[PDB]
Amino acid sequence: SKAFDLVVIGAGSGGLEAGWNAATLYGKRVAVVDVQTSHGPPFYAALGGTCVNVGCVPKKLMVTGAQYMDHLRESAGFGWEFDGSSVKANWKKLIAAKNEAVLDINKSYEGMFNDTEGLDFFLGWGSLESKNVVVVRETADPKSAVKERLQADHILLATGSWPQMPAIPGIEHCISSNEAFYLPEPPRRVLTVGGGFISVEFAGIFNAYKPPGGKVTLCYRNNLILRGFDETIREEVTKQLTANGIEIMTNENPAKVSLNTDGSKHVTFESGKTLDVDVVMMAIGRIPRTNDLQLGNVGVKLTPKGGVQVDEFSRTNVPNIYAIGDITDRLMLTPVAINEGAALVDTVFGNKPRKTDHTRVASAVFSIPPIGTCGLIEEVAAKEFEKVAVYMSSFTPLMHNISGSKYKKFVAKIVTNHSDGTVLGVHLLGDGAPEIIQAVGVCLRLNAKISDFYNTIGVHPTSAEELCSMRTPSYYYVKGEKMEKLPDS
Amino acid sequence: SKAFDLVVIGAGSGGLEAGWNAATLYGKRVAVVDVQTSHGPPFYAALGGTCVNVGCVPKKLMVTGAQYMDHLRESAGFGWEFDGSSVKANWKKLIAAKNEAVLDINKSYEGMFNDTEGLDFFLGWGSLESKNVVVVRETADPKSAVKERLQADHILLATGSWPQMPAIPGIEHCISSNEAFYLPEPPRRVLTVGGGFISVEFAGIFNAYKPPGGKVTLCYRNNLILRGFDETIREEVTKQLTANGIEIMTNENPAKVSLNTDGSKHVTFESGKTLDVDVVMMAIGRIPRTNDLQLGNVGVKLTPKGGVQVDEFSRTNVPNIYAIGDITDRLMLTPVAINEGAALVDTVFGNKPRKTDHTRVASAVFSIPPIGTCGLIEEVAAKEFEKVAVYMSSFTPLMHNISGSKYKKFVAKIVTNHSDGTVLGVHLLGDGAPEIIQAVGVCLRLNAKISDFYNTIGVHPTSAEELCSMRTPSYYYVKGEKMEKLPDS
Ligand SMILES: Cc1cc2nc3c(=O)[nH]c(=O)nc-3n(C[C@H](O)[C@H](O)[C@H](O)COP(=O)(O)OP(=O)(O)OC[C@H]3O[C@@H](n4cnc5c(N)ncnc54)[C@H](O)[C@@H]3O)c2cc1C
Ligand SMILES: Cc1cc2nc3c(=O)[nH]c(=O)nc-3n(C[C@H](O)[C@H](O)[C@H](O)COP(=O)(O)OP(=O)(O)OC[C@H]3O[C@@H](n4cnc5c(N)ncnc54)[C@H](O)[C@@H]3O)c2cc1C
């Protein structure tokens, strides 16, 4: 067995940050375990994590590809002429370019390990033998051959999450986001199941790359997609996906899937409705990846919903064992996992406690058009504060009247504590929204007030200047009650 | 003769804000004077101002159209196929769409005047008869017939600026940005004269719409374009314009222009080099429009360079006469002019003095790719502060390695006071830059430190998140001198 200050199980976003920082900033001896060195089947995730291999990085490339469908059409309003009937979207090329880009990242990460002293990679499946020993095996099977036994002063659990699949008849005919990344050809008809960001993101990707006579359908078991997001924006994204040819089935959920004779899938819904598609993609949730770690050997406690139970400092109930990222089933974001890994390492090896702030985190949805958001939505804020103000701007930007995409209304909302003007949340929908919101996150850290926004001089002409052009609330909540104007008193 | 609380000469960015505020917020009687009711020849600007008619608004629509040249090309990396030889950029269509959009704004300003009590528009040329009378005439000639005599308690000068044309033989064969907006056809060969934002922005526009066998040349009298901007950005923009097929002639300046027998232009540079082009667009500066105001009648004082001299509250040497916007030859931006207009009105009619902060104003250049900037460049900071740190990131984002535009390095630079970490300037080059910098403007009003950026959680994947990923200075200025590391002293 080999001895290490820190052993990390999972070479993903959080795991690599922790490992890199411990080794290069604190001079510790670090071991990092992952199940394969490059993306794709059989394990999908790999060295670099979910985000690099089957997540943020590849899907952003694919969304960027999808945006060209809109660009090509929209150029005509600006005088661009070309043979429309010659236009074809080559999925095979997209996927091949994506694969090369992901592989290049895989390769650079193994170059990092090769070049970095005291930071070593171990290929295999990690699990807990005792509270000081990580065993590395050939496969996920607990009975597979032992490759390595790693003695660890500290153990970090960073194995992320995995797609949830519903227990319905014909689930074997369905796929998840994992497989979506490797489809040999683009589906003519596809059902995306779920109303969260993965389902909305992929619907837009499939919508652009669909062969002729194609149809993308997204279904969601409740009334309105994208729960947790601003309600205006939820309603507007629904309208804007619809206007780009995507069918949105709300209050619907698959009961059953079967094969048609030609090989296509026949979906039956709980309500009795039916749909024939070429691909059914489940995006109904991601669950912490705890099953292979043999946590019962050491008694690391889990949450009711299956995450590793931690405190604010990422500590489990076992003293030298920690958990960060998706395995904790909190905020499933890459930069949050990274921030968590860095704080952990500062605490443990730097001996100066640091915890990640999980509030006021800026995030994005790469829908078409995209969402950018930071902080509280108005419903949540109205429950915590007696007086809240909402500043709303919503209209089609000029260039989209010219482009023909008149449906692309840009939404900008600011939610404040109206007692002192403190900005509680900012919510954006439209082109550039993810890029705009980043520095907004810095503003909220500094406890910006609405006056800090409107007293800042705009950049003209942009969409972002709308954030600096709102002085009078559109409406209020007074102890939970929505109203246009404050009572005369 | 008509009596008014406020008479505004010039119905542009600053004038309209001031007029609207005085009428609607303070209930004053206001007159606003402009020379045209809609955009275009002979006087180009009109109701709405330079920005609405021959500036920011149409310019941005035209750059947006220009971006499609890149989009169509870059789509191929993501699998998009089409008949490339069928591609045509219809300049006439762009201009027609631009015109309708501008005209729509012209028309809406007329409804504003009609619906608003005590806010009236007068068509004609405004000038000062005396301290308390603005005279409106048919033309700029002070001998032309009087249309109106407006008795004014207060007078606001807001006539903006006008293109500078060098005194060279054959200047009559050259145009400015004004005429560029109305060219009947797109020029095959064009020379844009100047290294500032207008010359660069139009170079990009003409480059996208040029007919077959076209060439855009930009010339600049000194060594490196875009003086006043970040040095890394100046160098990068030069590289990236060149890579998109624009010729940049540095250390060259037109000495004369003559008309060829085919109507094209023969340019001779001070060096003796020559170049044949179809259009010569002068973009060597903009100078305050003071001549037609007959300021000598009242003795309003001008600065050495020709602007109306004002204090920080926009007051002239004459108590009831004020000046804002480009006529003051300070910061020539629409939102600054607007902010000055609002502050002046609060001061004069609210009797609570307010002034515009001309520091840390965010701004953009809509080059391809675009620049976004706020605050000080490092050479300027190194003079005001004893120790400054520069945080720098410059690389081609993944998508542009796939797109084929490998020359598109995104540049992010933060300049700080290294004594306390206070952010002094932020400078960006690349897609989204103008949108990213807006909320950065808010951050600098809040006196953000570098640590406020790097302790903010990133939105991934974005270009903007680079701003939150820089912890270690790339280099420093100590007592005005550049060095990679701080001295041990
Ligand atoms: C389709 C999709 C799109 C997404 N888009 C975004 C986005 O746009 N922005 C964003 O911020 N986030 C996005 N995410 C979420 C983001 O990918 C995760 O939040 C982040 O990757 C979690 O990081 P982590 O360190 O917790 O784990 P991961 O990055 O998932 O890394 C866990 C690693 O552990 C390995 N592993 C698992 N079991 C073992 C074992 N027992 N032994 C050894 N190794 C093991 C896995 O192979 C994996 O590489 C997306 C996710 C998906 C699925
Ligand atoms: C090509 C170009 C691109 C630009 N791009 C941007 C940009 O992207 N972002 C930005 O912030 N700024 C931009 N600007 C600058 C911006 O347009 C100006 O800073 C702004 O319009 C100035 O506002 P103003 O109120 O001072 O004057 P203006 O908006 O120019 O208004 C002055 C008005 O007064 C009228 N007038 C003149 N003389 C008389 C007279 N004697 N009697 C009656 N009326 C008169 C004129 O017709 C004009 O309408 C651009 C300018 C140009 C030329």
Residue numbers in the entry:
A (entry chain A), B (entry chain B): 2 to 490
What's written in the study?
T. brucei subspecies, along with all parasites of the order Kinetoplastida, possesses a novel thiol called trypanothione [N1, N8-bis(glutathionyl)spermidine]. Protection of the parasite against oxidative stress is achieved through the oxidation of the dithiol form of trypanothione (T(SH)2) into the disulphide form (T(S)2), followed by regeneration of T(SH)2 by the NADPH-dependent enzyme trypanothione reductase (TryR). However, the enzymes trypanothione reductase and glutathione reductase are highly specific for their respective disulphide substrates such that selective inhibition by small molecules can be readily achieved. Metabolism of trypanothione and other low molecular weight thiols has been established as an attractive target for drug discovery in several trypanosomatids and TryR from T. b. brucei has been specifically validated as a drug target, inter alia, by conditional knockout experiments.
Large crystals (approximately 0.8 mm × 0.3 mm × 0.05 mm) diffracting to 2.3 Å were obtained in drops containing 2.0 μl of protein solution plus 1.0 μl reservoir solution, where the reservoir consisted of 0.1 M bis-Tris propane pH 8.0, 5% PEG 400, 2 M ammonium sulphate. TbTryR is a homodimer and each subunit of the final model comprises 489 amino acid residues, 1 FAD, 1 NADPH, 4 glycerol and 1 sulphate molecules. Also present are 786 solvent positions that were modelled as oxygen atoms and 1 PEG400 molecule (associated with subunit A). The same applies to the nicotinamide moieties of the two NADPH molecules, which were not included in the final model. The overall structure of TbTryR is nearly identical to that of TcTryR (rmsd = 0.6 Å over 482 Cα atoms). All the catalytically important residues (Cys52, Cys57 and His461) and residues interacting with T(S)2, including those involved in binding the spermidine moiety (Leu17, Glu18, Trp21, Met 113, Ser109, Tyr110) are conserved between both structures.
